[PDB]
């Protein structure tokens with residue numbers, strides 16, 4: 001159906017939840033599981049680092065957003081399109097999009113709003129896929145993501 005969106009949601013959703021809970025989801029990945037697994041391995045590697053390399057900027061943006069409830073979470077999509085979409089696309093910016101997402105996911109857990117995590121993963125996936133599909137396809141999607149960061 002829309003395999004790119006589905007795979008993206010599973011990858012982004014799993015990373016955010018893992019980041020928030022600190023525990024790995026042992027369920028099998030859906031279609032294209034080998035790729036999604038590698039993708040998650042990759043996000044654990046480069047995503048974690050981004051959150052630390054931009055510690056100050058990340059906490060600065062989080063404060064600016066002042067996320068306290070569900071309505072604040074809903075407001076995030078507008079900011080994502082404003083900051084992420086409106087700019088030249090590259091894997092780094094995509095990793096930052098997803099990494100700050102994980103940063104926000106951990107925050108949501110600290111303020112006991114864990115139920116907003118999956119909805120947030122959906123919003124991020126919507127922004128990534130629905131505004132950058134052409135770039136993603138041209139760059140070989142997630143297979144391209146894994147190859148890009150291959151060590």
Ligand SMILES: O=C1NS(=O)(=O)CCOCCCCCCN2C[C@@]3(CCc4cc(Cl)ccc43)COc3ccc1cc32
Nearest residue numbers: 054057058061076079080083084093096097100101104
């Ligand atoms: O390359 C970037 N900026 S840059 O050019 O200045 C590169 C350096 O920046 C350092 C951190 C700067 C602060 C982080 C701002 N964000 C987080 C966003 C906005 C709110 C939001 C909410 C949620 Cl749930 C997910 C994502 C996001 C959008 O994803 C991004 C993607 C790329 C950059 C910055 C962001």
